C-alpha cells in the first residue's frame, strides 16, 4: 500500500551513475508491477521503464530497471544534464492499489560557473501605479547563489522575491531572478540601486542610478 | 495521438467542478484512462481510472467520495464533489496501463480570490531584454517572444505568489526589435509589449 522511494535526492557529475530504490511494504502484483517515470518542472511525467525492467519506446539505454517482489532499482549511467529531473516509481498491488513513490530529485553536478548579472530599472508606466518592481538576473551559473540588494548603500531586508530556472538540459546551469518591490515614493526617494550575487565566497555586483 | 485535459479554473471552496480528458487519434475505450494530480511542488498522486480490461472504475482509498469518474461519448470526466484548499493542484489524465501517454495537465485553484489579468512591463538595462508579468490570478500565464518564433535565449522564471495572493514572473531573452506575448487564459486576456533597448 506504500512504496518507499530512496533517496529523496541524489547527485552525479556528468558521465556518473545514479541508483534510485523503491521498496514495497509487500510484494507488488505478479512480483513485477512497478514502473519508473521522469518529470521535469512544468512538464507531465514520461514513462521510462514498465514491468520492472522493460524500456519504453524512445527511452535511452542508460536508464535500467531491475528487481522483483518488494525491491526495485532504477539506475542511470553516463548521466547527462538532460537527466536533471524528479524520478518516481509507481506500483500495483492485488486489490487495485496503485501508489506512487514520493520521488527522487537528481541534481547533475560540475565545476562552478560564475554568473553574469543584469539589473532592469522599472518601466516609466510602473511608477505611476504607486508600486515599483526592480529585477536583477543572475545568468548561467552553478551551483546555487545568494542575492543582496543595496539602495543608496543601505542593504534591503524586505520586498525581495527570488525565482530559479531548473537546470539547463545542455549545460546544467541555473538562472535566477531577484525582484525588489518598493512604493513609488520610496523609489523616487533614492538614486543608486545595487544587486549583489554571491557564489560561495565571491560576489558579482551590478547597479544603476534612477533617471539614466 | 494525444490526451488533453480541460476544466481547470479558480473556484471557491465547496463549489463542485468537472474536468474532462479528450483523446485524439485513438478510442477512449482502447486503454486504461487515469486521473493523477500534483499539488504545487509536491509528488504525483493517483486518483482513479477506468480499466480497458474489466471496463470498471476504480478509486484510490483516500479519493473515494471526493471525486467521481464518469465518461461521455467523447471524454473521461473527473468531478471534484466538494473542493478544499488542499485540492489546489495540476490534474493530469493519462492513457495506458503504465501511464504511457500524459496530457499537459489542467490547473485547479481552490481559493476566495477574484480573477485578475496581469500588467506587463518592459525590462531594459539602463543585449538582454524582458517582460515583467505582474499581479495575475489564477495561474497560469504563457509568455512567448515574437509570437512563438523566438525561443533561443529565452528564460521564463517560475511564478511567485505575493502577500496579495497575486502571482508575478519575468521572462528575458538575449539577442544582438522584440515583442513579448502574454496570455492569461483564465480571463482570455492577451498583452503584447514591444521592448526597445534603453
Amino acid at each position: 500500500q506504500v512504496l518507499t522511494q530512496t533517496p529523496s535526492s541524489v547527485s552525479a557529475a556528468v558521465g556518473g551513475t545514479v541508483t534510485i530504490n523503491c521498496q514495497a511494504s509487500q510484494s507488488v502484483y505478479n512480483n513485477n508491477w512497478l514502473g519508473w517515470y521522469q518529470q521535469k518542472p512544468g512538464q507531465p511525467p514520461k514513462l521510462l521503464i514498465y514491468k520492472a525492467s522493460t524500456l519504453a519506446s524512445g527511452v535511452p539505454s542508460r536508464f535500467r530497471g531491475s528487481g522483483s517482489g518488494t525491491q526495485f532499482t532504477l539506475t542511470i549511467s553516463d548521466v547527462q544534464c538532460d537527466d536533471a529531473a524528479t524520478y518516481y516509481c509507481a506500483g500495483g498491488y492485488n486489490g487495485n492499489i496503485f501508489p506512487f513513490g514520493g520521488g527522487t530529485e537528481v541534481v547533475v553536478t560540475g565545476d562552478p560557473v560564475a554568473p553574469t548579472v543584469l539589473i532592469f530599472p522599472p518601466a516609466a508606466d510602473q511608477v505611476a501605479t504607486g508600486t515599483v518592481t526592480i529585477v536583477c538576473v543572475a545568468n548561467k551559473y552553478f551551483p546555487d547563489v545568494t542575492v543582496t540588494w543595496e539602495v543608496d548603500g543601505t542593504t534591503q531586508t524586505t520586498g525581495i522575491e527570488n525565482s530559479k530556472t531548473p537546470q539547463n538540459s545542455a549545460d546544467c546551469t541555473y538562472n535566477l531572478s531577484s525582484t525588489l518591490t518598493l512604493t513609488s515614493t520610496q523609489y523616487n526617494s533614492h538614486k543608486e540601486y545595487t544587486c549583489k550575487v554571491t557564489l560561495g565566497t565571491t560576489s558579482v555586483v551590478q547597479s544603476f542610478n534612477r533617471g539614466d | 495521438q494525444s490526451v488533453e485535459e480541460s476544466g481547470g479554473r479558480l473556484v471557491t471552496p465547496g463549489t463542485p467542478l468537472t474536468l474532462t480528458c479528450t483523446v485524439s487519434g485513438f478510442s477512449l475505450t482502447s486503454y486504461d484512462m487515469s486521473w493523477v494530480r500534483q499539488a504545487p511542488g509536491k509528488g504525483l498522486e493517483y486518483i482513479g481510472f477506468i480499466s480497458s480490461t474489466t471496463g470498471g472504475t476504480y478509486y484510490a482509498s483516500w479519493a473515494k467520495g471526493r471525486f467521481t469518474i464518469s465518461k461521455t461519448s467523447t471524454t473521461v470526466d473527473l468531478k471534484i464533489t466538494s473542493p478544499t484548499t488542499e485540492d489546489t493542484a495540476t490534474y493530469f489524465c493519462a492513457a495506458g496501463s503504465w501511464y504511457n501517454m500524459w496530457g499537459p495537465g489542467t490547473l485547479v485553484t481552490v481559493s476566495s480570490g477574484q480573477p485578475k489579468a496581469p500588467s506587463v512591463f518592459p525590462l531594459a538595462p539602463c543585449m538582454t531584454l524582458g517582460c515583467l508579468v505582474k499581479g495575475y490570478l489564477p495561474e497560469p500565464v504563457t509568455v512567448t517572444w515574437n509570437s512563438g518564433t523566438l525561443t533561443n535565449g529565452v528564460r521564463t522564471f517560475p511564478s511567485v505568489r505575493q502577500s496579495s495572493g497575486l502571482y508575478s514572473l519575468s521572462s528575458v531573452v538575449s539577442v544582438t526589435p522584440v515583442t513579448c506575448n502574454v496570455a492569461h487564459p483564465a480571463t482570455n486576456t492577451k498583452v503584447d509589449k514591444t521592448v526597445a533597448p534603453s
Binding site: 502484483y29 508491477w33 514491468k51 500495483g92 492485488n94 486489490g95 487495485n96 496503485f98 | 486504461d32 481510472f49 480499466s51 480497458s52 480490461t53 474489466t54 470498471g56 476504480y58 496501463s97 503504465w98
Partner: peptide
C-alpha cells in the same frame, strides 16, 4: 480473495 486486478498491460 480480491477484485480482479484491473490493469492488463
Amino acid at each position: 480473495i480480491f477484485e480482479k486486478f484491473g490493469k492488463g498491460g
